Symmetry: C5
Subunit: 206 residues, 5 copies
């Protein structure tokens, strides 16, 4: 307890919180998705509901410590309210995201942070064709709402969405699921914006 | 980090929050809308549901700094709770607005602030005629709930609503969308009342 | 800004909050309703849903100032959390009231406060007869939940509910709308208890 | 104002909050219910929805004062967050209770507190038979979630639920409504557990003087 | 009151909060479920809704006291916000869990804590076959979201779910209900992850 209390106190009570990235000190956040269930489809509104979790990973110099100074502690868990977290947003949501997991992150001695929120999301998707065998494809972009690619860069570790927690008796079967970094220009703005595009092809289960 | 922490501390911890505008020190807030989706229509209640975001822009002397004094930082992101924000309200909503984006603003060295909330709104609209080819027109006014035009003046940069993120497979197709400043004067009251009128003509997609 | 910051600091940071009215220092609160829409009727549950706003007005000696001492400021806006507000409650609601407007009040140099919350309310109402031409009458009382008439007296400025923001294409048409002070006496207790009874006669629009 | 500010400051800012009752310093809470409306019935889920308020009353030595020391103040209103309140819970709810009234209590100079929250509750009830003339009976127990009868004793002032605010045009008509203290014993445990059982018999119903004075027998103290 | 106020002040205001378990100071949390009602089934979405409460139990050295020093107090009740609590999560929920009970725990002089939240849960379950006599089986895992088995170990006191508060007039009848500790290993990662699997077989009454 004592060593950990002391570490948390040195990292959090001895200087102000990390104020977020800038042009001069940009930050890279890695995302990966873990699909759990397509819960429903609404063909009268073109909304589809997904349950998933999302691994977010980034690294801050101000969260580093030497384990020899703190009883060989190499990592700890802490409330997400204690640290900065990136403002990753689904760009085509139609309802506020519902949080299904505790807001807690893992911080490691090299300054890396891992945060894995689970979420239910409603997003814009025309499910016409879902009852066929070819199925239907939908997409949703995830991006920083307020930071450009000059401040936050996104990436993936893999292009394949992990389906190993996908609910075997879902009403919908996943044909494919990818997650792809894109660098986007908009007409408003010279700065690039980075997103991760989640593309899911699915159909009604046999 | 250090320069930014120092700037945030100088702007926010060294004086009280901006107490809002008055008759003598009025403020101009610029709005623009970015329609993303008409999600549904309810002809039994005369409610229509819209997903959009809204750019809000204003400028405060108390948020100015010289970038040479702060390592050449020209802008930063910060939680909307750290600053004053205007109380722009949809006058004909029928439900609390659902927030779809992080509550974060961009503050620039000239004291200008940009806040871009994304929202789902239910508002009063008779959708009779939507299945026709002429479609239907609905309107919603946006105004300060408690500040008159002597304290907050609202403006638009353009009269055309941005439709470049409108969902291509929405059930509803946008025929036109405008956003127009209106100034009202009433016999009861010396104060002008300002609103921005969002007028949208739409119909069922072919 | 500076004069206003100073006024707010003198009124709010230099003494404890007004602890509410007593027998010895009673208060009068004036209410008026502004009906905007009867959104729906549910004849299987006898609930009706109304959207409206409510003007509340009262006066405190502790909110007085001399404008000459504060740069001629005669009024300001402030968050309702900064001040005491009366606990006016709809006695026959069936759901928590949904707030549609920012919780901000206007305070004037004579100590008077104006607070105008907009609300969606579900309340107990048998809509049988609404499809007829005579329509149907429903009523809802608004009262202080915990203060007697010795501490808070309610009144209206007029007995006519204002209908000038009523939605012209509502499914329901207002035939009449009144707001009337009533005094309730309990045999146990000398104190009167006050309510304002909102009585609305309405029917389906032609 | 000044005397009241001073009283609130002496009662709340000068010592820690009452930490709740114990075996050695137990407390009695008195409940009564005031049924307002059976709003609906769901026969596909066996849930029924009620709107009511609930008078709760208890007394603490730490909330006592002498009115002569405080300008003859005998009572005041205050936010429920300023005081300890009992954790009375509906044992068979199926949704979080929705609060319909401001969270404010009346505290009196003898240390007694009166708190009257209004609530919408969904609870477990098979409504089969509601469309008949015999109607249907549902029950829900209200109890302390964590305190035994050694720490909190519950009681009622009357066994009859007050129906004077019951909505006359509800879809459902009340045949009877009682509220009854019960003592529950479990074989594991010496401590009694107290509840108040709200029993309502009702059925589907079959189917002007808005006057400036109204007379009653202050329910929502 | 006085002795209790003093105890609470010594345990909570005189040192920082317990920062949670580590590899070096792990913790065991014991769970048991008390099913109250299967409220509904949705066969178009494969979601089922359960109402239950959950007994959680663990023990901290930092919550110990000697009753002789505090007027013979052996236990007290306190708001769950005053203490660390484990981040036990239903892994296959489809909506945020709705809390039905006050967030209050019992702390005992040996440092043990008992916390019993009541909850409504929507979770992933195919109810096909529920109208038959064999009924249908569904399952939901409960686990620490962020702590591995090196930091938090879960266990049960019994493998039988307690059904003594089950609603006699539910639309659904419980055929069986078990709760079982499981250890999960992933090939990427050396640390085990622990869950308690709640398995419920039920049918229309
Ligand atoms: C994540 N999204 C990216 C960046 C913010 C959010 C919404 C989109 O931005 C804009 O519309 C504008 C940005 N800057 C502007 C300037 C003038 C007009 C529009 C914008 C794209
Ligand atoms: C604090 C700091 O880095 N100051 C620099 C300054 O040296 C440089 O001359 C200028 C370029 O105009 O940018 C800024
Ligand atoms: C106050 O009013 C006087 C008289 O009109 C005026 O001269 C003065 O400028 C006002 N004060 C301020 C700070 O505006």
């Amino acid at each position: 307890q004592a060593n950990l209390m002391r570490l948390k106190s040195d990292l959090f009570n001895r200087s102000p919180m990390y104020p977020g990235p800038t042009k001069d000190d940009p930050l890279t956040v890695t995302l990966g998705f873990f699909l759990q269930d397509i819960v429903k489809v609404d063909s009268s509104t073109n909304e589809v509901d997904l349950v998933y979790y999302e691994r977010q990973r980034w690294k801050l110099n101000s969260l580093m410590w030497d384990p020899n100074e703190y009883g060989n502690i190499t990592d700890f868990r802490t409330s997400a309210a204690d640290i900065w977290t990136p403002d990753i947003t689904a760009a085509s949501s139609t309802r506020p995201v519902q949080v299904l997991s505790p807001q807690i992150a893992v911080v490691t001695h090299d300054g890396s942070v891992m945060f894995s929120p689970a979420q239910r999301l409603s997003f814009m998707c025309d499910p016409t064709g879902v009852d066929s065998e070819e199925g239907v494809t939908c997409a949703v972009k995830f991006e920083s709402w307020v930071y450009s690619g000059f401040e936050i860069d996104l990436k993936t570790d893999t292009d394949q969405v992990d389906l190993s927690s996908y609910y075997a008796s879902s009403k919908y079967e996943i044909l494919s699921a990818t997650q792809t970094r894109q660098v986007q220009h908009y007409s408003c703005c010279p700065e690039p914006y980075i997103d991760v595009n989640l593309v899911v092809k699915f159909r009604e289960r046999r």
